[PDB]
Ligand binder design. Structure first.
Ligand SMILES: [Mg+2]
Ligand SMILES: [Mg+2]
Ligand SMILES: [Mg+2]
Ligand SMILES: [Mg+2]
Ligand SMILES: [Mg+2]
Ligand SMILES: [Mg+2]
Ligand SMILES: [Mg+2]
Ligand SMILES: [Mg+2]
Ligand SMILES: [Mg+2]
Ligand SMILES: [Mg+2]
Ligand SMILES: [Mg+2]
Ligand SMILES: [Mg+2]
Ligand SMILES: [Mg+2]
Ligand SMILES: [Mg+2]
Ligand SMILES: [Mg+2]
Ligand SMILES: [Mg+2]
Ligand SMILES: [Mg+2]
Ligand SMILES: [Mg+2]
Ligand SMILES: [Mg+2]
Ligand SMILES: [Mg+2]
Ligand SMILES: [Mg+2]
Ligand SMILES: [Mg+2]
Ligand SMILES: [Mg+2]
Ligand SMILES: [Mg+2]
Ligand SMILES: [Mg+2]
Ligand SMILES: [Mg+2]
Ligand SMILES: [Mg+2]
Ligand SMILES: [Mg+2]
Ligand SMILES: [Mg+2]
Ligand SMILES: [Mg+2]
Ligand SMILES: [Mg+2]
Ligand SMILES: [Mg+2]
Ligand SMILES: [Mg+2]
Ligand SMILES: [Mg+2]
Ligand SMILES: [Mg+2]
Ligand SMILES: [Mg+2]
Ligand SMILES: [Mg+2]
Ligand SMILES: [Mg+2]
Ligand SMILES: [Mg+2]
Ligand SMILES: [Mg+2]
Ligand SMILES: [Mg+2]
Ligand SMILES: [Mg+2]
Ligand SMILES: [Mg+2]
Ligand SMILES: [Mg+2]
Ligand SMILES: [Mg+2]
Ligand SMILES: [Mg+2]
Ligand SMILES: [Mg+2]
Ligand SMILES: [Mg+2]
Ligand SMILES: [Mg+2]
Ligand SMILES: [Mg+2]
Ligand SMILES: [Mg+2]
Ligand SMILES: [Mg+2]
Ligand SMILES: [Mg+2]
Ligand SMILES: [Mg+2]
Ligand SMILES: [Mg+2]
Ligand SMILES: [Mg+2]
Ligand SMILES: [Mg+2]
Ligand SMILES: [Mg+2]
Ligand SMILES: [Mg+2]
Ligand SMILES: [Mg+2]
Ligand SMILES: [Mg+2]
Ligand SMILES: [Mg+2]
Ligand SMILES: [Mg+2]
Ligand SMILES: [Mg+2]
Ligand SMILES: [Mg+2]
Ligand SMILES: [Mg+2]
Ligand SMILES: [Mg+2]
Ligand SMILES: [Mg+2]
Ligand SMILES: [Mg+2]
Ligand SMILES: [Mg+2]
Ligand SMILES: [Mg+2]
Ligand SMILES: [Mg+2]
Ligand SMILES: [Mg+2]
Ligand SMILES: [Mg+2]
Lengths: 101, 62, 45, 77, 23, 94
RNA sequence: UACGGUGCUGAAGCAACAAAUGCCCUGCUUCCAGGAAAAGCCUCUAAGCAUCAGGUAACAUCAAAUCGUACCCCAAACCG
RNA sequence: CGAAGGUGUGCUGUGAGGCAUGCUGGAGGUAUCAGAAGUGCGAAUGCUGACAUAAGUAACGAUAAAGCGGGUGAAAAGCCCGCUCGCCGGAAGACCAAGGGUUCCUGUCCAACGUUAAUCGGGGCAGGGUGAGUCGACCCCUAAGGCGAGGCCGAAAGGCGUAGUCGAUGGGAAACAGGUUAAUAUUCCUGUACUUGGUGUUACUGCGAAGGGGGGACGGAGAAGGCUAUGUUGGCCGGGCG
RNA sequence: AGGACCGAACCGACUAAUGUUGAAAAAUUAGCGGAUGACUUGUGGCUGGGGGUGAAAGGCCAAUCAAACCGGGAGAUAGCU
RNA sequence: UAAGGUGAUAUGAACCGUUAUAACCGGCGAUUUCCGAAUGGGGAAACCCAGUGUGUUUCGACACACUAUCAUUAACUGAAUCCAUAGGUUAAUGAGGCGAACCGGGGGAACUGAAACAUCUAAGUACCCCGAGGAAAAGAAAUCAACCGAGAUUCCCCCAGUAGCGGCGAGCGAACGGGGAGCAGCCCAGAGCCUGAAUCAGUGUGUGUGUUAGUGGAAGCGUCUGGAAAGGCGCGCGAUACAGGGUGACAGCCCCGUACACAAAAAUGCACAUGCUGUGAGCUCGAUGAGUAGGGCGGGACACGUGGUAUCCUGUCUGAAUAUGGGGGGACCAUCCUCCAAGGCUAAAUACUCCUGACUGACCGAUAGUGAACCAGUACCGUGAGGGAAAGGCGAAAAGAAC
């Protein structure tokens, strides 16, 4: 897998191309959840137990993993991340300027 | 934990099995009632009594 | 009137049960025709 | 069954043809008897479900050679 | 829920003649 | 002598009902939910050994499970066994 | 007193008659169309076993397992 | 900056047709010349789905029969409660086997089901509920019969059948009374019991069968006697003086 | 005493009416025959298709019988619609 | 391999895990309830009842293992019987059951066509049964041919719808010969003497190859439309990769890939390098498959229906020679030609797909394609064999409508 959990990504399409943010957790099918960018206004119908109030909450919903790319801060662009065997231990590296994360 | 469970004697593995079973019975009688919030302990003791019985089965006869 | 199915599970299992199918020769081809057909219950029993 | 215990003569099938060539199916049955054969190397009697050509082939050979062939064929004679 | 209790109409059983026949 | 892991495997639950509570108070009978293939002597030995309580006699029956309809597909709940273990005269066990 | 209940007390509690297809009856009388089988159970012994085992009159002590026990059952629940 | 498809119009072709466009639709379509066909529907008492028609017509399923008040609700002819009325009473009452399989009981909802309404239900949902030494199966024993090691027979399959082994609707040990649950009770609780086995202790000595024998062990009809269930009458106790 | 008598259970099914797309793919009502026998019925067994069984009607064999039902030969064949 | 997982409707609490004992995937093990050939006895499949031996026992009993039937052989025994014999007691060694089609064998129809029907056809077809294998059968001339010559078997194309068979009707229909695929030949019928060399079968160490996890894997931006660009506009780059599938509208350059280049501790199919255990090639002399070939009768297969009918198989009766002998050469006879039955074994080409992968479709796109795009041989019907449906689509993402 390329787009891991920690790294600040920049999106490439959607209603908010040109925005960016961190990554919270990646789902199974390949839909990551980014730090508050493709937010949705989920209406909430309440519950007596379980402690939920009930209202419009503007949480974040998913965005597909082939629309995010790692924010190459050494140039400011987005950059496709390739892989390399180092010390017997496969790690990531960029393509523009070729540094290793 | 089977690395250390190889490194016990046969009767010590038997007694480990029996005390694991007493833990499993007390967790069973607790989770029958409203007495369990740590729910993963059931799965933990069940997998570990499987491991202890496996190591009995591979010691005795081999 | 008196209809033509007076159910009795003794006669039912004794004439259409699995062992009463398994005993004969074209009874074992009855069970092997339903397994290839893939049915839910092979016989009554 | 109807088997010559010496020569293995099974009942074969054929057609009764009529004079007007109407055909029907029939079973040629081998001529069987139950003869009791005297051996010497066992010094006793032994029965056989023999045919008449079986009695003639045992007349030709001798019964002990035929019993050797029958036990090599593997049957309780 | 949604039971949808609409099974197909298997209706026709048999017949007979049973009529005064012109002959 | 019964196997100790067998006596640890037999008892599965207690039972929680109005009849169970009234039978616990008026007759000193605990009501248990036991394994499917248990028997009377094994249940009596297990209830004397695990809870460490003197036990007179045991009364077992087999509850037939219901047939429910979850969603739209029909299904069978699993049968089990219920056991009225009485206790000795003047002996507490919760 | 939650009108649903619930606890303590509680007298008389006999006699005569009638009487069944049920019991004695797996009996008795009678007829011919001549009216299941094997184990329980009682008893005799051959083998053998030789005062060992066993048997039987007790006496104490332990057990009696598993399964069906809801409900309808001349029907709104079985067969139509 | 809107494809197929759908719906409208206008033009045009000798006809099957074609083109342009407005609306709906929201992602595919395909010139030209050739090629291959599951290539054209109005009829087959054609096949499947949908919707008519008769028509808001027949019918609402025993000619045992209902009426009133009070409760519940948004809503009572049908539900709950009370008061009357009617019907069965060798059944339209009670206990079962076969059979069904949670319909039994509580709480909740009335979408569908109920030949109508429904707060009701044998409907949906969640929970509860069946307690056996003595009842019945399981067990021991066999009937008609079934399978049937060997065997006999049979192109093969297999058919028959002995030892056997299964097969109840029959034979074989033992529990009744009273009380409780919303739901079990000859099962739970109280009282009083009884049966078959092991074990061990005391006394006594011929025990033992795959056997021999007794018994188990047996029809139809009738007739009488003794009784009992059970009822009626009196007494006795308690209530009553309309 | 009896394949005796009158008559309920129980077995039937003789007449009439009602239904006949019914309450019911043979029933209800009012009468009717037998009702200690060649009776009737519970439960289990047996006989298999040119075969069974039949107090005999070509009847009955799962609402079907001058030769059942299910699959296969099989898209039988059809000078016919 | 690994930073994310605790299978799906299916969210939730509870957790585990981030440098490699979380999870995921492959190899090998262990557990493997009950029914099922069921195999300890039984049986209304998923249940009841055991007995023997070994243990432990708080004497209440639990735990373990065993126990079917036949075929073969081994020992023990052991009847009427005298030895003996059957029989019985164990012991091992195997089989049993399932499975689509293909193969060989044992049985074997009828509708139908003949414009009717009986010979015939349908057809040795459907079907029943037995047996074995990944192939099976056949197979090494008692075969052809024609005075030349070929030198197993099987399969394909021709010969040829010819020669024939035929109530001479309906129809059935070769072969000789030639082109191809592939080509492999040996042994017991028995003794001496070389005396272990060719050889195959079975058991193993090493190489290589293939499978069961996998890893790397190129190259793009700015703008207008738009909800969103993969679209239009301009401008670049990769390409042994422009096969494909996604991605908020059509992407070689966003992702997964493919091309290519590698990787397996372990089991492993195979080519073997080759050790081990059985195994003997090799030489000479001899032997040349008997109730058999033929014959009478009755049938069957060859294209061949008794016809002038060769040849092959046998239900029955019969019955030789045996290398100077015999079979055949399409009645039969004489010369000639050729070949040596009555005992075996044998690879390949060929038939098939219940399956396991990759790939393609002038194949279908929900009344189609399997019956089945879905929790289908399910609901349901039938006592039972069996019969047997309907039923896909919100969106891009539930943002599934707070109030
Ligand atoms: Mg993308
Ligand atoms: Mg069925
Ligand atoms: Mg014929
Ligand atoms: Mg019980
Ligand atoms: Mg009851
Ligand atoms: Mg538009
Ligand atoms: Mg189109
Ligand atoms: Mg259009
Ligand atoms: Mg498309
Ligand atoms: Mg027309
Ligand atoms: Mg039409
Ligand atoms: Mg209509
Ligand atoms: Mg209308
Ligand atoms: Mg009208
Ligand atoms: Mg009118
Ligand atoms: Mg009306
Ligand atoms: Mg009514
Ligand atoms: Mg009315
Ligand atoms: Mg009222
Ligand atoms: Mg009313
Ligand atoms: Mg009255
Ligand atoms: Mg009643
Ligand atoms: Mg229900
Ligand atoms: Mg009720
Ligand atoms: Mg209720
Ligand atoms: Mg309403
Ligand atoms: Mg209604
Ligand atoms: Mg209900
Ligand atoms: Mg009793
Ligand atoms: Mg018995
Ligand atoms: Mg018998
Ligand atoms: Mg038999
Ligand atoms: Mg046998
Ligand atoms: Mg009985
Ligand atoms: Mg009895
Ligand atoms: Mg009740
Ligand atoms: Mg009790
Ligand atoms: Mg006796
Ligand atoms: Mg009598
Ligand atoms: Mg009295
Ligand atoms: Mg009085
Ligand atoms: Mg007065
Ligand atoms: Mg009379
Ligand atoms: Mg009447
Ligand atoms: Mg009378
Ligand atoms: Mg027939
Ligand atoms: Mg007639
Ligand atoms: Mg009929
Ligand atoms: Mg016929
Ligand atoms: Mg047709
Ligand atoms: Mg045909
Ligand atoms: Mg999940
Ligand atoms: Mg068994
Ligand atoms: Mg038994
Ligand atoms: Mg068995
Ligand atoms: Mg014919
Ligand atoms: Mg004909
Ligand atoms: Mg014809
Ligand atoms: Mg072969
Ligand atoms: Mg040869
Ligand atoms: Mg020559
Ligand atoms: Mg990769
Ligand atoms: Mg790449
Ligand atoms: Mg779109
Ligand atoms: Mg020769
Ligand atoms: Mg010879
Ligand atoms: Mg001969
Ligand atoms: Mg001959
Ligand atoms: Mg000849
Ligand atoms: Mg001949
Ligand atoms: Mg010849
Ligand atoms: Mg010639
Ligand atoms: Mg559609
Ligand atoms: Mg379909």
């Amino acid at each position: 897998a390329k787009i891991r959990r920690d790294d600040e990504v920049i999106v490439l399409t959607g209603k908010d191309k040109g925005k960016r943010g961190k990554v919270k957790n990646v789902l199974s099918s390949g839909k990551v959840i980014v730090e508050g960018i493709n937010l949705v206004k989920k209406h909430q119908k309440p519950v007596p137990a379980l402690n939920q109030p009930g209202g419009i909450v503007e949480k974040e919903a998913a965005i597909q993993v082939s629309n995010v790319a790692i924010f190459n801060a050494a140039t400011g662009k987005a950059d496709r991340v390739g892989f390399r065997f180092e010390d017997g231990k496969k790690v990531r590296f960029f393509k523009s300027n070729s540094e290793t994360i | 934990k089977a690395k250390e469970l190889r490194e016990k004697s046969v009767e010590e593995l038997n007694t480990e099995l029996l005390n694991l079973l007493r833990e499993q019975f007390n967790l069973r009688m607790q989770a029958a009632s409203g007495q369990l919030q740590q729910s993963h302990l059931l799965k933990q003791v069940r997998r570990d009594v499987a491991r202890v019985k496996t190591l009995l089965n591979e010691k005795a006869g081999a | 009137m008196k209809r033509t199915f007076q159910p009795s599970v003794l006669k039912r299992n004794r004439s259409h049960g699995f062992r009463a199918r398994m005993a004969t020769k074209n009874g074992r081809q009855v069970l092997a025709r339903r397994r290839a057909k893939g049915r839910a219950r092979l016989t009554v029993s | 069954s109807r088997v010559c215990q010496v020569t293995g003569k099974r009942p074969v099938t054929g057609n009764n043809r009529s004079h007007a060539l109407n055909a029907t199916k029939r079973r040629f049955l081998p001529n069987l008897h139950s003869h009791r054969f005297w051996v010497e190397s066992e010094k006793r009697f032994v029965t056989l479900r023999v045919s008449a050509k079986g009695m003639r082939v045992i007349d030709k050979k001798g019964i002990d050679t035929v019993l050797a062939e029958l036990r090599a064929r593997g049957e309780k004679y | 829920a949604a039971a949808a209790a609409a099974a197909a109409a298997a209706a026709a059983a048999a017949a007979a003649a049973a009529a005064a026949a012109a002959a | 002598m019964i196997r100790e892991e067998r006596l640890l495997k037999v008892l599965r639950a207690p039972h929680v009902s109005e009849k169970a509570s009234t039978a616990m108070e008026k007759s000193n009978t605990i009501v248990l939910k036991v394994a499917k293939d248990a028997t009377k002597a094994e249940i009596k030995a297990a209830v004397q050994k695990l809870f460490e309580v003197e036990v007179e006699v045991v009364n077992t029956l087999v509850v037939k499970g219901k047939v429910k309809r979850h969603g739209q597909r029909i299904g069978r709940r699993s049968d089990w066994k219920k056991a009225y273990v009485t206790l000795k005269e003047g002996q507490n066990l919760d």
